Amino acid sequence: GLFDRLGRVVRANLNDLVSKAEDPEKVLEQAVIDMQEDLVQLRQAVARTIAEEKRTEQRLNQDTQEAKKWEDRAKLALTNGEENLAREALARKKSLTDTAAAYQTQLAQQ
Amino acid sequence: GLFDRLGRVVRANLNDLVSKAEDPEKVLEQAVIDMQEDLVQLRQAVARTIAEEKR
Amino acid sequence: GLFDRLGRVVRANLNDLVSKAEDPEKVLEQAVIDMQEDLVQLRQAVARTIAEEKR
Amino acid sequence: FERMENKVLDMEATSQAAGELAGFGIENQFAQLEASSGVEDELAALKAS
Amino acid sequence: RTMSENLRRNLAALEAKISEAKTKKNMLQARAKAAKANAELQQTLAAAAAAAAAAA
Amino acid sequence: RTMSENLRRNLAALEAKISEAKTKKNMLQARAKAAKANAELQQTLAAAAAAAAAAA
């Protein structure tokens, strides 16, 4: 629209008037200081992604040791002749190894 | 945003104006004194981890 | 019914909003204190069954 | 117990925070290659003496 | 007594799929929190650094 | 009298798992306090020392 173009012109003149009150020698190194804190913001966020990557690796170690526990319960059920509980334990083991493969995939992307 | 960039420029000029009133010979060894108390803070915390390990 | 499902969603959001005002460190040991009085209730009833057995 | 376990994972998350700090240490690590070879070089001289 | 064996298996199978849904819920909620942080951090850092550096 | 043997074992088994939860509570609360201190000390010392030294 016409008034958008006129508005951006009058706003740009006012912004240039302010821009030439700023000393180029002093403000140009303030711009480098500002750019150094921008890197300070990026390092905090990047490190937080590493923590998230390690958290999916923790879930993977929990569900894999839970699958070892259920395998021992299946062995115990078979020595006690309770084959129906051994199948139930194997079903818990399968859902833990299948979710562990989903976490392995998530971890590879991370 | 534009006013964030302009704000950081005017704040940086004021911070530089203050920075050149500080004598480089005297303040640079104050910076080493400050760095020595930073090590004083670290040793207290490290020792507290040893107590936690023993607990 | 549809309004039962919608009702349980809005009630669950409100219950979660209240749940995060509770400090996890302080309330989790209140939960263990509460669980200790639950055992206090069970011992009184169990002892009353012994009296009934003797009767 | 479940909500307390979610609180326990705050310590696990803090362990990854130290791991990201260690990431900067991996770029610095070339100094450890010279440090490790140096201690074995004087140790070899001490064993030979 | 043959119906109570069937009901006892159906009750265990129901809680098994409720249990599965609860573990899936946590992993899905985690990915959504992570993805929200990745986008904000990457876009904010890239845009702010490039714009300020070029102008100065 | 066969029900009171069952109840006396169930009462002992309940307090046994309440007892287990109480010991676990203390160890978990300790790790959370330690982890909060480790993070603050490591980050504060590393950041303050490096920034001040480089600037000076």
Swiss-Prot record, chains B, C:
Looking at the record's lineage, which domain of life comes first?
Answer: Bacteria
Q: Which phenotype arises from disrupting this gene? A: Essential, it cannot be completely disrupted. Cells with very low levels of protein have no ordered thylakoids, are barely green and are non-photosynthetic.
Q: Where in the cell is it found?
A: Cell inner membrane
**What's this protein's function?**
Required for thylakoid formation.
Q: Which family does it belong to?
A: Belongs to the PspA/Vipp/IM30 family.
Task: Please report the name of this protein according to its UniProt entry.
Answer: Membrane-associated protein Vipp1
